[PDB]
């Protein structure tokens, strides 16, 4: 357990870097096999190009190529590729979208193709679950023409989040096994200083990863009798999609875990709560929430209601009046107690001592003498009602030394 030290006391903890994509369902714009249809594998040996053909059949697992194969275990000698439908050229965009439902720090994105690589393609992140998409990186042989970015634009302080376009890793050539691989901090000026770079802190943060294949390579011949089979030779196919990174829990977790809803969330510690660990757990609002830092754990603490209140709320006034120690304010405070911490008795009650402060019957009712005492409200401690002139006793039901009873209820002791 890295979230507390050798002794009991909490410390900042960060979860492990991983292939965030592994085993995850990737959403795809296209998959061959529904209905089933022919595809062709093209190979070259020098002067010649050879061609084998096969059926993509979704309904038959031995001939299917579903998205699950993008994030399965990659054994290099039993490769499994997702395969798009044949010839979705332009402007047809085919997309692999990985929604983590949770903020991650992305460190790389890797693709391994079983087809030739895309001529043009783009990696995107979302920071707001589905809604908006921003570009991480482009890859194309026509950057200005295709993505309206300039070729190999130099990354600079001025804008360190620049989605570069590049003709690198665009060659039709490795006809399979082509490898494209974006790294988020590769190039970025402040990467060495990353942990003090707010610009880059943002840059790596993302909830989703979209991969858009926008145009695909064709051969320089494409024979005329080959019309159907040449068309059937062009598709996108990927054997392995990775997204390196870690969960963003705010120093309050060492694990991310799927939950009640089977949705990914921090295994949240230090009495914190929420998916990012960005707020406090119920009944733990004595001090306000913070990211755990290098020096300090900032475990938000359990507010005290002396076993009288079920809920509690934070208040800054109270917090500030103590030396920033406690600010919890207990609510609907039960059993005829009241206050911040339910530590004293409701007006018109008093503490039955001996019975300790925490006990359900720690406040007995006041019960003043209805003509002897002036008022209903006792002393919280000692229960002494406020007696009229020449009356004493805790209930104020006897005249004092010096005093006799009167015939009037108003002034019932007189001398």
């Amino acid at each position: 357990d890295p979230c507390s030290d050798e002794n009991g006391h909490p410390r900042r903890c960060i979860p492990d870097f991983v292939n965030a994509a592994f085993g995850k369902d990737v959403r795809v714009s296209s998959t061959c096999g529904r209905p089933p249809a022919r595809y062709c594998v093209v190979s070259e040996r020098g002067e010649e190009r050879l061609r084998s053909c096969h059926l993509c059949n979704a309904s038959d697992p031995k001939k299917a190529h579903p998205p699950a194969f993008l994030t399965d275990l990659n054994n290099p000698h039993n490769l499994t590729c997702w395969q798009s439908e044949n010839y979705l050229q332009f402007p047809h965009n085919v997309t692999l979208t990985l929604s983590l439902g949770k903020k991650f720090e992305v460190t790389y994105v890797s693709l391994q193709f079983c087809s030739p690589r895309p001529e043009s393609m783009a990696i995107y992140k979302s920071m707001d679950y589905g809604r908006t998409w921003v570009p991480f990186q482009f890859y194309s042989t026509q950057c200005r023409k295709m993505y309206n970015r300039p070729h190999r634009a130099p990354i600079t302080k001025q804008n360190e989040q620049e989605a570069v376009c590049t003709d690198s890793h665009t060659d039709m050539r490795p006809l399979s096994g082509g490898l494209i691989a974006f790294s988020t901090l590769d190039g970025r000026p402040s990467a060495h200083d990353f942990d003090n770079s707010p610009v880059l802190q943002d840059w790596v943060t993302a909830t989703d990863i979209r991969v858009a294949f926008s145009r695909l390579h064709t051969f320089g011949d494409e024979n005329e009798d080959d019309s159907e089979l040449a068309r059937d030779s062009y598709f996108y196919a990927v054997s392995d999609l990775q997204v390196g990174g870690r969960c963003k829990c705010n120093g309050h977790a060492a694990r991310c875990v799927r939950d009640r809803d089977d949705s990914l969330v921090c295994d949240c510690r230090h009495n914190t709560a929420g998916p990012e660990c960005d707020r406090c757990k119920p009944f733990h609002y004595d001090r306000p929430w913070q990211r755990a830092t290098a020096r300090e754990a900032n475990e938000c603490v359990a507010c005290n209601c002396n076993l009288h209140a079920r809920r509690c709320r934070f208040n800054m006034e109270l917090y500030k009046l103590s030396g920033r120690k406690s600010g919890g304010v207990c609510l609907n405070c039960r059993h005829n107690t009241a206050g911040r911490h339910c530590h004293y008795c409701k007006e018109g009650y008093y503490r039955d001592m001996g019975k300790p402060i925490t006990h359900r019957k720690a406040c007995k009712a006041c019960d003043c003498h209805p003509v002897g005492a002036a008022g209903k409200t006792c002393n919280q401690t000692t229960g002494q009602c406020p007696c009229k002139d020449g009356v004493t006793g805790i209930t104020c039901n006897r005249c004092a030394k010096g005093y006799q009873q009167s015939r009037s209820p108003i002034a019932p002791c007189i001398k």
Partner: peptide, 19 residues
């Protein structure tokens, strides 16, 4: 010791306070 006698009070004025 000698507690308040409720019967002793004259309530003809202050009719409503009588316990």
């Amino acid at each position: 010791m000698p507690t308040l006698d409720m019967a002793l009070f004259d309530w003809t004025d202050y009719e409503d306070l009588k316990p």
